[PDB]
Amino acid sequence: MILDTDYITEDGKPVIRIFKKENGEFKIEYDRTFEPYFYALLKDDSAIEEVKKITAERHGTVVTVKRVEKVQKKFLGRPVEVWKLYFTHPQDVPAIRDKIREHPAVIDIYEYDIPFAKRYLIDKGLVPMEGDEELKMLAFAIATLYHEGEEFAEGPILMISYADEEGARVITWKNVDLPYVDVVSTEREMIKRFLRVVKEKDPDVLITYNGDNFDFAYLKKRCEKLGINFALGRDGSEPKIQRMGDRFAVEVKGRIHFDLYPVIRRTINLPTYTLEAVYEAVFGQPKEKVYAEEITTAWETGENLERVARYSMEDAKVTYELGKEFLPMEAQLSRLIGQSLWDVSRSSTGNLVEWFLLRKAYERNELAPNKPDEKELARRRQSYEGGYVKEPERGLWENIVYLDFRSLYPSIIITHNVSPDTLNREGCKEYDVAPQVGHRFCKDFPGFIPSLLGDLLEERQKIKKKMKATIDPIERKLLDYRQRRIKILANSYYGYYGYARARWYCKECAESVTAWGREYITMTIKEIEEKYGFKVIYSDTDGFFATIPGADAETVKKKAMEFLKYINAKLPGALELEYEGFYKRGFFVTKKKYAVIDEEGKITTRGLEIVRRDWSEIAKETQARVLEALLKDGDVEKAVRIVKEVTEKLSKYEVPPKLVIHIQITRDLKDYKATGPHVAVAKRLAAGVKIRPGTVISYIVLKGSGRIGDRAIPFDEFDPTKHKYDAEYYIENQVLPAVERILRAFGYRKEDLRYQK
DNA sequence: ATTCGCAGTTCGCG
DNA sequence: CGCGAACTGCG
Ligand SMILES: Nc1ncnc2c1ncn2[C@@H]1OC[C@H](OP(=O)(O)OP(=O)(O)OP(=O)(O)O)[C@H]1O
Ligand SMILES: [Mg+2]
């Protein structure tokens, strides 16, 4: 099982390093034979010798062209012969590719911007994480002595806990008597103790939670203080850090640093991403949280250190369980894209498509295009129209059915052969003309990209069928996450057409897939109203909510199933309309804001203020309560009593202050053109932190009139006595708007609700 | 740093 | 105050 790939330089030569474990043994393979290259299209084959003389220099040493080869490639399905220019070192290309393209005898060059490590996997035909090997893995987490100081790693690490299959152990240098706690002399003795354990446990996957930005960054800066060689890797190297765009990540060579934080962010969407809520949302079991202020206060006095070692023991055991459930999900995802697990688990969806097509373009012998310069990327500022959101029928309806298309946008690409190489190809015999935009796509041959999208949806349906055949609630819950990732990955190919930095950028292909679907969802809605006589309530892009105004649930289900028989046969190719779910009652506020319930006791909310992160907890709590009462048995008279019991309770001072709103800071400190209630909290207290993009600023609005921007004052600087809370504003700006937008369909102009006296 | 459609707060500002 | 620009997060 190829774990990862790498390359180093020995005396000006490249040495590919293949990290793999096979038959239960770790092994490194070195390949000094592989050679970098990039293709060049020439006007004539007589001017190749005058091109074989181009010379540059990287660091004061001459750059030449090693070997030259003549191959036949296919540019967007068009045959072409380009010259393959081999070089001695991968870094020779960026020093000479710009001098070669400026040559008057060349037309253009391709495949000059690609990592030499990923090039070895694209060529040769190697897929990481491919095999039946059982990977030995352990998770670890650390506890720090954190005062409210300034420097990052000024406080020492107190206890490094780790957990594998044998259990969770803690290593501290303080007097703690527990079965799983290892006591050492000083902080230096436990860091070298952790190295002794990592080398002894022999793991291939190092699991951490936010270890990219904290743990490895903390242990490193702490070893700078103690002068310790943090040789974690199989190669014997210290954990290397690579900056990804803005943030950074840490890799351990010879192993796989599995940071669960970037993976779980995309896998499941939750209000908070603390390890307590993640373990609760995945395993249904509560986990306690002790804070650094509680840890520091407990370590200074030397008392209550049993909980700190108990909490740290939980962090290692919880991280290992999570890292064990999500590893097969990222292992297969690494097999699809064909790159290292460390890259795939933390890279964007746009790069996963980039790595996948480059591997396929080498199989199809397709010469991949290039990324745009400033000129071409400026042309791609064009926008297109896509998505038909129907104005919903405001009010409460019953016995509603949600019939949504199954992978609408990818199926349109597969069925209509939507591809840049099929777009307006003059000469073919069969065309598929797109609505409104008028683009036509050749169908004589399977175009590049639709042929790849077919097998991706087959890998998702296999996971969908495993869910039905699985009785384990947690094991089937992970499969729901896997089939959901393939859905997001498939639609990324459609958005990849609209991506300005995409190699296979085709706005026409993107605008056509949006032209379709808009035609399909409007066609499908009219077939339900004119025939069968459904009352379509609201549609977004893939489906709609339809019902019969008076028929019971039995008639609506049967008639909807017959409608599925009378649409799928009419829809061509991969286009299919499926029965996703029936619902007892459902409220539709406005566009993309609605609530719905199953026949079984549960509530599903989409777009409403409950899911919004930047709202007061009382606004989400009350809105969920008035929704829970409405969908259970109507009883709006009882729901109105709920909207008044909190406003009257808001007259007196609130419960221990919820009413915390959360808005992170985008842009950069002062790059704003307008300051709201937050940002003003960032403008103040800035002389503070770096105020880097992505910092949540939670404030509390108090005092009285005017601002807003001048009435907050966050949460860390709050006092219920000297700083009189408002107990208002939230009755007009938080709670009441998120509620009136619901009850207004019943005839309440907010004249009711309050007042006293 | 896949695409676009979407409701909404906030408020400087003639 | 009504309207628009900026800003936030969700689908
Ligand atoms: N991030 C996205 N960007 C653009 N279009 C998207 C995105 N996610 C989805 N879409 C597209 O817009 C809607 C549609 O995603 P559905 O919620 O309707 O779910 P499925 O149909 O894919 O999969 P199912 O049958 O429910 O199992 C998808 O085509
Ligand atoms: Mg969805």
Side-chain angles (χ1 to χ4, degrees), chain A residues 1-149 151-153 155-199 201-220 222-284 286-345 347-384 386-393 395-475 477-527 529-530 532-637 639-666 668-701 704-707 709-710 712-722 727-733 735-748 750-757:
Chain A
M1 176 178 297
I2 297 182
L3 292 162
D4 202 326
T5 186
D6 198 336
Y7 97 99
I8 56 182
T9 306
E10 283 198 354
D11 276 317
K13 272 74 184 306
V15 177
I16 295 286
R17 300 197 300 180
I18 299 96
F19 301 145
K20 57 193 175 188
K21 179 209 187 178
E22 54 199 34
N23 297 15
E25 217 86 26
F26 181 83
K27 182 179 180 179
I28 303 178
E29 182 191 1
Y30 300 93
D31 194 326
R32 295 176 175 85
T33 56
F34 199 69
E35 40 198 334
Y37 59 84
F38 79 94
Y39 303 94
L41 172 60
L42 308 192
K43 302 172 178 177
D44 192 90
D45 293 356
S46 62
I48 181 211
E49 308 292 345
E50 297 177 349
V51 167
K52 287 164 58 66
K53 306 290 184 176
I54 300 179
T55 294
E57 52 184 9
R58 43 179 310 189
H59 63 76
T61 172
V62 63
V63 176
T64 184
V65 183
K66 180 196 172 186
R67 189 183 282 182
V68 187
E69 202 174 10
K70 187 171 174 297
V71 291
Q72 302 80 2
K73 308 296 290 184
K74 294 145 55 185
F75 193 12
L76 295 178
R78 179 183 299 180
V80 66
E81 287 196 355
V82 291
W83 284 101
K84 199 175 186 181
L85 310 176
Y86 293 104
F87 299 93
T88 52
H89 196 269
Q91 289 290 323
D92 293 324
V93 181
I96 201 181
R97 72 191 188 198
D98 298 298
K99 199 70 177 62
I100 291 184
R101 184 169 52 181
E102 293 177 354
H103 196 278
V106 316
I107 303 174
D108 204 327
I109 60 177
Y110 321 92
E111 302 211 272
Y112 50 81
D113 176 20
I114 181 168
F116 191 73
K118 305 181 182 303
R119 167 56 63 183
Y120 191 84
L121 294 183
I122 289 181
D123 305 9
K124 285 287 177 294
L126 308 183
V127 185
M129 309 305 300
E130 195 179 29
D132 60 332
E133 196 70 44
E134 282 257 336
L135 293 190
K136 181 59 180 180
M137 52 180 176
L138 78 94
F140 77 90
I142 66 179
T144 63
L145 187 66
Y146 176 76
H147 302 102
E148 200 180 349
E151 246 187 286
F152 171 62
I157 314 179
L158 295 185
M159 39 189 57
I160 300 179
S161 57
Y162 62 94
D164 52 73
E165 280 287 86
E166 295 146 342
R169 302 295 305 277
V170 185
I171 309 176
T172 182
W173 52 292
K174 203 62 176 299
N175 187 6
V176 180
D177 185 72
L178 285 181
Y180 50 81
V181 164
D182 290 353
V183 190
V184 297
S185 299
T186 173
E187 181 189 23
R188 177 196 308 270
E189 298 297 331
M190 82 164 185
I191 292 185
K192 310 180 73 65
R193 176 81 155 181
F194 187 65
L195 281 177
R196 179 57 180 175
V197 174
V198 172
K199 300 170 188 176
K201 293 295 180 299
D202 198 81
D204 295 331
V205 172
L206 290 181
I207 312 174
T208 41
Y209 194 74
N210 197 16
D212 279 325
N213 299 25
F214 184 69
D215 294 58
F216 286 84
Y218 205 102
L219 282 131
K220 177 180 180 179
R222 211 64 203 179
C223 290
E224 318 268 297
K225 181 179 193 305
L226 298 160
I228 302 178
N229 178 24
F230 205 15
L232 271 182
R234 294 274 127 183
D235 166 275
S237 58
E238 298 184 10
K240 186 175 180 58
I241 300 181
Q242 295 180 343
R243 186 170 187 174
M244 287 200 60
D246 296 2
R247 299 181 181 181
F248 24 75
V250 180
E251 63 170 353
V252 182
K253 297 202 170 304
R255 319 180 195 269
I256 297 179
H257 178 207
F258 194 6
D259 189 9
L260 293 174
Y261 182 70
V263 171
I264 299 180
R265 286 175 66 185
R266 309 186 305 264
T267 306
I268 179 61
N269 295 285
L270 302 176
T272 173
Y273 276 97
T274 178
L275 195 60
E276 288 68 25
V278 176
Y279 181 80
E280 279 183 292
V282 173
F283 287 96
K287 197 199 68 173
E288 193 184 349
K289 172 60 172 184
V290 308
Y291 303 93
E293 316 99 32
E294 280 192 9
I295 291 182
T296 299
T297 312
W299 206 84
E300 299 164 346
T301 66
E303 308 293 338
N304 245 333
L305 285 183
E306 183 180 356
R307 294 208 322 172
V308 183
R310 198 269 302 176
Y311 162 80
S312 187
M313 188 271 192
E314 295 280 325
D315 283 11
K317 177 172 169 294
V318 165
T319 309
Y320 174 69
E321 282 185 324
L322 294 172
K324 180 167 134 294
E325 311 281 18
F326 290 77
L327 185 68
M329 173 182 130
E330 296 295 326
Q332 185 219 357
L333 184 63
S334 178
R335 289 190 290 262
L336 299 176
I337 304 301
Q339 301 303 324
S340 67
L341 197 152
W342 183 83
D343 286 290
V344 178
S345 56
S347 185
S348 308
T349 56
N351 276 326
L352 296 183
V353 179
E354 204 88 307
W355 299 335
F356 183 78
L357 303 182
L358 285 167
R359 168 178 287 267
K360 294 301 179 178
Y362 191 77
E363 300 178 1
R364 272 63 173 171
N365 205 266
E366 284 282 322
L367 174 136
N370 307 325
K371 297 181 180 179
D373 53 353
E374 186 216 342
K375 167 200 169 186
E376 170 59 31
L377 195 147
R379 183 189 67 89
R380 304 183 178 182
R381 294 291 301 273
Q382 293 232 16
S383 58
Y384 58 89
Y388 161 68
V389 186
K390 182 181 180 300
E391 180 181 350
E393 304 293 311
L396 168 62
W397 307 121
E398 304 180 8
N399 293 323
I400 67 183
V401 185
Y402 187 60
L403 305 178
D404 77 288
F405 274 83
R406 182 210 298 186
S407 301
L408 175 60
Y409 291 149
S411 299
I412 297 167
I413 300 178
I414 300 174
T415 307
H416 302 283
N417 231 253
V418 181
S419 181
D421 53 277
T422 68
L423 174 79
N424 293 5
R425 198 52 56 191
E426 288 288 340
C428 289
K429 191 167 184 55
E430 183 176 354
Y431 293 163
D432 277 12
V433 182
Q436 306 179 28
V437 301
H439 304 305
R440 58 183 187 179
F441 301 88
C442 164
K443 288 193 58 185
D444 287 14
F445 58 94
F448 189 89
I449 289 176
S451 58
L452 308 174
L453 267 177
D455 290 68
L456 263 64
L457 297 178
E458 178 176 332
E459 286 295 334
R460 182 194 179 186
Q461 291 296 327
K462 287 191 173 185
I463 305 176
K464 293 285 297 182
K465 297 300 180 179
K466 271 213 294 291
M467 304 181 55
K468 280 133 163 49
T470 305
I471 65 180
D472 200 335
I474 296 184
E475 173 179 333
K477 187 177 185 177
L478 313 172
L479 298 169
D480 190 16
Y481 296 156
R482 297 183 60 175
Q483 63 90 10
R484 196 152 299 167
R485 293 289 256 90
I486 311 297
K487 154 194 167 183
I488 306 302
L489 180 59
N491 299 125
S492 299
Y493 290 87
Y494 139 75
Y496 182 79
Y497 287 150
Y499 195 0
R501 265 120 180 181
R503 298 177 182 265
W504 289 269
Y505 169 87
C506 172
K507 181 185 77 282
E508 310 86 340
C509 313
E511 202 176 13
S512 297
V513 179
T514 58
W516 308 94
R518 276 189 297 178
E519 185 195 24
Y520 287 114
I521 197 56
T522 51
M523 167 189 179
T524 311
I525 285 176
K526 292 301 114 185
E527 300 294 338
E529 296 184 346
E530 298 181 346
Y532 290 81
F534 274 105
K535 183 55 187 299
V536 176
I537 306 174
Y538 156 75
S539 186
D540 209 323
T541 37
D542 259 60
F544 55 90
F545 288 88
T547 180
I548 309 183
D552 46 2
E554 291 78 308
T555 302
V556 178
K557 296 177 188 181
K558 302 166 188 175
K559 279 269 133 58
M561 294 303 302
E562 302 176 17
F563 181 42
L564 298 174
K565 286 178 57 63
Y566 177 63
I567 192 62
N568 292 285
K570 304 180 63 177
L571 290 173
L575 276 305
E576 294 178 1
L577 189 74
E578 66 172 2
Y579 183 92
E580 195 132 82
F582 174 81
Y583 302 105
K584 193 176 184 180
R585 300 176 186 266
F587 196 94
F588 296 81
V589 179
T590 176
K591 283 194 180 67
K592 295 177 176 177
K593 275 198 277 174
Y594 60 94
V596 83
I597 64 162
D598 299 334
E599 294 178 330
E600 191 193 7
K602 200 181 66 180
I603 299 186
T604 302
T605 58
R606 306 289 256 273
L608 282 174
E609 291 85 14
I610 309 175
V611 194
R612 302 278 297 185
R613 176 188 291 102
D614 54 354
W615 277 75
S616 60
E617 196 190 286
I618 181 65
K620 320 179 192 185
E621 182 188 23
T622 50
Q623 189 178 49
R625 288 175 58 185
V626 305
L627 283 173
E628 184 180 359
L630 176 126
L631 294 138
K632 271 291 184 176
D633 194 9
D635 209 2
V636 190
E637 293 282 357
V640 171
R641 296 183 178 181
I642 304 179
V643 318
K644 299 181 181 180
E645 285 159 343
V646 288
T647 55
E648 193 198 49
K649 189 164 185 56
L650 208 46
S651 304
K652 59 179 175 180
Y653 274 96
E654 323 89 338
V655 299
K658 54 185 59 173
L659 49 80
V660 190
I661 84 107
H662 303 63
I663 295 183
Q664 64 182 11
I665 298 297
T666 58
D668 178 84
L669 185 58
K670 299 182 181 180
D671 269 296
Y672 284 51
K673 279 182 169 297
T675 62
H678 80 302
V679 185
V681 190
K683 295 293 292 185
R684 294 190 304 269
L685 199 48
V689 213
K690 299 180 178 180
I691 316 297
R692 46 182 171 178
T695 52
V696 184
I697 298 205
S698 309
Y699 62 80
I700 301 299
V701 171
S705 175
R707 310 266 264 272
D710 308 338
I713 295 299
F715 197 93
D716 299 278
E717 312 174 8
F718 182 78
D719 176 76
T721 59
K722 86 186 182 189
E728 296 163 352
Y729 159 86
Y730 293 92
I731 207 170
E732 295 177 353
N733 299 37
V735 189
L736 176 64
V739 211
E740 156 266 0
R741 300 160 201 168
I742 302 179
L743 293 345
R744 208 160 199 84
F746 301 91
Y748 300 94
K750 79 203 309 177
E751 299 177 350
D752 207 338
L753 301 82
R754 309 147 319 177
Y755 200 24
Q756 307 283 61
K757 300 180 180 180

mmCIF file of all heavy atoms in Angstrom, chain A residues 743-756, unseen atoms left out:
data_model
loop_
_atom_site.group_PDB
_atom_site.id
_atom_site.type_symbol
_atom_site.label_atom_id
_atom_site.label_comp_id
_atom_site.label_asym_id
_atom_site.label_seq_id
_atom_site.Cartn_x
_atom_site.Cartn_y
_atom_site.Cartn_z
ATOM 1 N N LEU A 743 -45.354 33.666 11.457
ATOM 2 C CA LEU A 743 -46.757 33.831 11.820
ATOM 3 C C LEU A 743 -47.495 34.808 10.916
ATOM 4 O O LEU A 743 -48.730 34.842 10.955
ATOM 5 C CB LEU A 743 -46.892 34.296 13.271
ATOM 6 C CG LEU A 743 -46.483 33.388 14.435
ATOM 7 C CD1 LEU A 743 -46.308 31.934 14.007
ATOM 8 C CD2 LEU A 743 -45.217 33.917 15.078
ATOM 9 N N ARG A 744 -46.783 35.605 10.114
ATOM 10 C CA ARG A 744 -47.453 36.595 9.277
ATOM 11 C C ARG A 744 -48.333 35.950 8.216
ATOM 12 O O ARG A 744 -49.281 36.586 7.746
ATOM 13 C CB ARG A 744 -46.427 37.518 8.621
ATOM 14 C CG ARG A 744 -46.962 38.909 8.323
ATOM 15 C CD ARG A 744 -45.831 39.905 8.154
ATOM 16 N NE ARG A 744 -46.292 41.282 8.305
ATOM 17 C CZ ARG A 744 -46.429 41.900 9.475
ATOM 18 N NH1 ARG A 744 -46.146 41.261 10.601
ATOM 19 N NH2 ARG A 744 -46.852 43.156 9.520
ATOM 20 N N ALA A 745 -48.047 34.702 7.834
ATOM 21 C CA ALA A 745 -48.934 33.972 6.938
ATOM 22 C C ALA A 745 -50.258 33.607 7.596
ATOM 23 O O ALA A 745 -51.161 33.125 6.905
ATOM 24 C CB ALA A 745 -48.241 32.706 6.431
ATOM 25 N N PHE A 746 -50.392 33.820 8.906
ATOM 26 C CA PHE A 746 -51.633 33.562 9.620
ATOM 27 C C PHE A 746 -52.419 34.831 9.925
ATOM 28 O O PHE A 746 -53.586 34.735 10.318
ATOM 29 C CB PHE A 746 -51.349 32.809 10.926
ATOM 30 C CG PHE A 746 -50.662 31.487 10.725
ATOM 31 C CD1 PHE A 746 -49.280 31.402 10.725
ATOM 32 C CD2 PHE A 746 -51.400 30.330 10.533
ATOM 33 C CE1 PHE A 746 -48.645 30.187 10.540
ATOM 34 C CE2 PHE A 746 -50.771 29.112 10.347
ATOM 35 C CZ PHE A 746 -49.391 29.041 10.351
ATOM 36 N N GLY A 747 -51.818 36.005 9.761
ATOM 37 C CA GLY A 747 -52.554 37.241 9.924
ATOM 38 C C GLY A 747 -52.240 37.994 11.198
ATOM 39 O O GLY A 747 -53.151 38.480 11.876
ATOM 40 N N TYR A 748 -50.954 38.100 11.531
ATOM 41 C CA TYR A 748 -50.489 38.852 12.695
ATOM 42 C C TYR A 748 -49.515 39.929 12.228
ATOM 43 O O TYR A 748 -48.360 39.631 11.895
ATOM 44 C CB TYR A 748 -49.832 37.929 13.721
ATOM 45 C CG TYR A 748 -50.748 36.855 14.255
ATOM 46 C CD1 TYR A 748 -50.768 35.589 13.685
ATOM 47 C CD2 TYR A 748 -51.591 37.104 15.329
ATOM 48 C CE1 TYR A 748 -51.600 34.600 14.170
ATOM 49 C CE2 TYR A 748 -52.428 36.122 15.821
ATOM 50 C CZ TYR A 748 -52.428 34.872 15.238
ATOM 51 O OH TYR A 748 -53.262 33.892 15.729
ATOM 52 N N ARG A 749 -49.978 41.180 12.221
ATOM 53 C CA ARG A 749 -49.156 42.350 11.917
ATOM 54 C C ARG A 749 -48.308 42.814 13.103
ATOM 55 O O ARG A 749 -48.116 44.022 13.272
ATOM 56 C CB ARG A 749 -50.067 43.475 11.447
ATOM 57 N N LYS A 750 -47.812 41.897 13.941
ATOM 58 C CA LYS A 750 -46.995 42.178 15.130
ATOM 59 C C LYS A 750 -47.586 43.272 16.025
ATOM 60 O O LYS A 750 -46.901 43.788 16.917
ATOM 61 C CB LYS A 750 -45.546 42.508 14.752
ATOM 62 C CG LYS A 750 -45.253 43.911 14.239
ATOM 63 C CD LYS A 750 -43.987 43.928 13.401
ATOM 64 C CE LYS A 750 -42.831 43.266 14.135
ATOM 65 N NZ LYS A 750 -41.599 43.198 13.299
ATOM 66 N N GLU A 751 -48.863 43.628 15.836
ATOM 67 C CA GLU A 751 -49.533 44.493 16.803
ATOM 68 C C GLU A 751 -49.706 43.790 18.142
ATOM 69 O O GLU A 751 -49.644 44.436 19.194
ATOM 70 C CB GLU A 751 -50.891 44.940 16.260
ATOM 71 C CG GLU A 751 -50.818 45.740 14.976
ATOM 72 C CD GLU A 751 -52.190 46.090 14.437
ATOM 73 O OE1 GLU A 751 -53.190 45.547 14.952
ATOM 74 O OE2 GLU A 751 -52.270 46.912 13.499
ATOM 75 N N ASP A 752 -49.920 42.472 18.121
ATOM 76 C CA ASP A 752 -49.958 41.676 19.340
ATOM 77 C C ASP A 752 -48.535 41.482 19.851
ATOM 78 O O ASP A 752 -47.634 42.231 19.459
ATOM 79 C CB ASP A 752 -50.640 40.329 19.086
ATOM 80 C CG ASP A 752 -51.279 39.749 20.336
ATOM 81 O OD1 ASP A 752 -50.875 40.137 21.452
ATOM 82 O OD2 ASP A 752 -52.185 38.899 20.201
ATOM 83 N N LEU A 753 -48.320 40.468 20.698
ATOM 84 C CA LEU A 753 -47.037 40.231 21.359
ATOM 85 C C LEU A 753 -46.671 41.438 22.216
ATOM 86 O O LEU A 753 -46.347 42.500 21.676
ATOM 87 C CB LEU A 753 -45.925 39.938 20.342
ATOM 88 C CG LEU A 753 -46.045 38.757 19.370
ATOM 89 C CD1 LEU A 753 -46.902 39.094 18.155
ATOM 90 C CD2 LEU A 753 -44.664 38.295 18.928
ATOM 91 N N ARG A 754 -46.719 41.282 23.549
ATOM 92 C CA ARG A 754 -46.606 42.396 24.494
ATOM 93 C C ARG A 754 -47.904 43.210 24.383
ATOM 94 O O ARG A 754 -48.761 42.843 23.571
ATOM 95 C CB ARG A 754 -45.320 43.191 24.214
ATOM 96 C CG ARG A 754 -44.064 42.345 24.116
ATOM 97 C CD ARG A 754 -43.115 42.963 23.112
ATOM 98 N NE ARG A 754 -43.840 43.445 21.939
ATOM 99 C CZ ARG A 754 -43.279 44.092 20.924
ATOM 100 N NH1 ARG A 754 -41.976 44.338 20.931
ATOM 101 N NH2 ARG A 754 -44.021 44.494 19.902
ATOM 102 N N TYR A 755 -48.123 44.284 25.157
ATOM 103 C CA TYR A 755 -47.164 45.007 25.991
ATOM 104 C C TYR A 755 -47.691 45.276 27.398
ATOM 105 O O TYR A 755 -48.891 45.185 27.656
ATOM 106 C CB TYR A 755 -46.806 46.331 25.305
ATOM 107 C CG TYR A 755 -45.517 46.979 25.760
ATOM 108 C CD1 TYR A 755 -44.492 46.229 26.323
ATOM 109 C CD2 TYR A 755 -45.326 48.348 25.622
ATOM 110 C CE1 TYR A 755 -43.316 46.826 26.738
ATOM 111 C CE2 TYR A 755 -44.156 48.953 26.032
ATOM 112 C CZ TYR A 755 -43.153 48.188 26.590
ATOM 113 O OH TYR A 755 -41.985 48.789 27.000
ATOM 114 N N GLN A 756 -46.773 45.609 28.302
ATOM 115 C CA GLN A 756 -47.090 45.989 29.670
ATOM 116 C C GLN A 756 -46.454 47.342 29.957
ATOM 117 O O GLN A 756 -45.345 47.621 29.492
ATOM 118 C CB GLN A 756 -46.582 44.936 30.669
ATOM 119 C CG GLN A 756 -47.045 43.511 30.382
ATOM 120 C CD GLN A 756 -48.488 43.260 30.784
ATOM 121 O OE1 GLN A 756 -49.410 43.898 30.276
ATOM 122 N NE2 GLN A 756 -48.688 42.322 31.703
#
